[PDB]
Amino acid sequence: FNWNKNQVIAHRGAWKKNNFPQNSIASLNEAVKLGCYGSEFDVWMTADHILVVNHDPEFQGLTIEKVNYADLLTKTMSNGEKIPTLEAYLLAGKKQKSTKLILEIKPSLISKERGIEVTNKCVEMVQKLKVTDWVEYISFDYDYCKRILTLLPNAKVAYLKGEVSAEQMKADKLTGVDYHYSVYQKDNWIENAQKLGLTVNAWTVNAVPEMQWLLAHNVDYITTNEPELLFDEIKKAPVAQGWKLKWADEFDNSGLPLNKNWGYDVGGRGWGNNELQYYTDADSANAIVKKGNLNIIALKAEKENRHYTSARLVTKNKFDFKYGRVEVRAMLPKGRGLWPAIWALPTDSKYGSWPKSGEIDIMEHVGFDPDSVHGTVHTEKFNHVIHTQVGKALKVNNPYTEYHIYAIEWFTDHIDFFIDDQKYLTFKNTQKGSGDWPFDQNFHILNLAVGGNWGGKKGVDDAIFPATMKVDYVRVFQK
């Protein structure tokens, strides 16, 4: 066995790219060629009790469970293949020893006892063909999963349906959870299962954001119709370089930002830049999580001594860190007068107040200049008050209508800045002391300033409100 040790599972074989039929010998062999960890397929049983491979219960209009296999042979798939028998599928996979065969037993549309029998026959067929080492099982029917585990105690078995606790599954000796990916977008489903020793798979994951999300949280497998795109995404993901996720807010809660992750900076006293906004305290009008992302909303609204309200969220003393990859996926608010920022301040200010203990601006944008997004470091020697800050600006296509990934990678000796994995700035540790390099322990800040010394130079377009900065996630990786 030269098993492939990657996360790619080819949903119904590798069928889509080369226009093969789903759940076919062609699509399975293509999955072997690509080097997938596994190739996934679906099993039904004919009326005359022959196991065959097809997702739907009707193969070209014939109800599999109610017709003879001979009846199904009157139909031909797009590449000329007939409906494969399970035996033919398992023997084709037997001819190679690098990718697993992920067998799905479909719940019977006839009866639970029939489907338990299907399960009996599937396990017997794996044993008769001696391919027990290739085959791993998934099912929507919890009873079939447990029946497999009775017949094969060391079998790999994962459950697909979603409504059983990770704690119960480990009790019943299942080895993985395999839910639709939306299911995991509730509280710590992934970490929970891994804590208990279950592998984590997710199905059908065809789009890049969900791929990068599942990789960031280090799932074991991803079932996809886009295995070639997934290999590409694995190469460019932070785990490929040794980054491990330490902390994330995927903003999958609804309501106010989580108190375990975010505190509020509150007040309208200018924030050192003569800014025009009052940052409010736990007010859903300026900070709200909904539909999978954080909304920071600036409003043209009098409050106390200011004409605008907004929000400034900080992880100070909730998540503080030194070194790492900081990744924030964000869509910027449009309009002259706005000054959104994604940045970081030191938690303890070991060298004195700003700018002596530093600041890192992962993303700054002033709405009067739409074609520039900026990254900047500030130190005692290199800051904007004395006109010595070290920073660069990149033009970003469509900053207001699509998400972009604003990122830093922060090491003992330098900091790299990225916009959508384009590196555009490196700040090197000069090794001449803390006035040149104060970086030892910081936290994150998301805010939408209005006006101010930088952002207000050309006035505020009072028509742009309400103005929303959307943040898909904040992820912090470390080595």
Ligand SMILES: OC[C@H]1O[C@@H](O[C@@H]2[C@@H](O)[C@H](O[C@@H]3[C@@H](O)[C@H](O)O[C@H](CO)[C@H]3O)O[C@H](CO)[C@H]2O)[C@H](O)[C@@H](O)[C@@H]1O
């Ligand atoms: O601490 C006293 C010192 O405060 C200064 O106010 C600074 C702000 O200039 C500073 O501004 C931030 C940028 O430097 C940063 O890197 O980008 C962010 C986001 O866009 C800005 O908020 O913020 C710090 C920390 O809150 C303030 O202390 C005064 O300008 C200066 O006169 C005063 O001595």
Ligand SMILES: OC[C@H]1O[C@@H](O[C@@H]2[C@@H](O)[C@H](O)O[C@H](CO)[C@H]2O)[C@H](O)[C@@H](O)[C@@H]1O
């Ligand atoms: O004033 C706060 C901001 O200062 C910026 O430095 C430069 C500005 O002083 C100048 O007016 O605009 C240029 C644009 O290239 C800035 O680089 C910092 O870049 C910001 O981090 C800081 O918030």
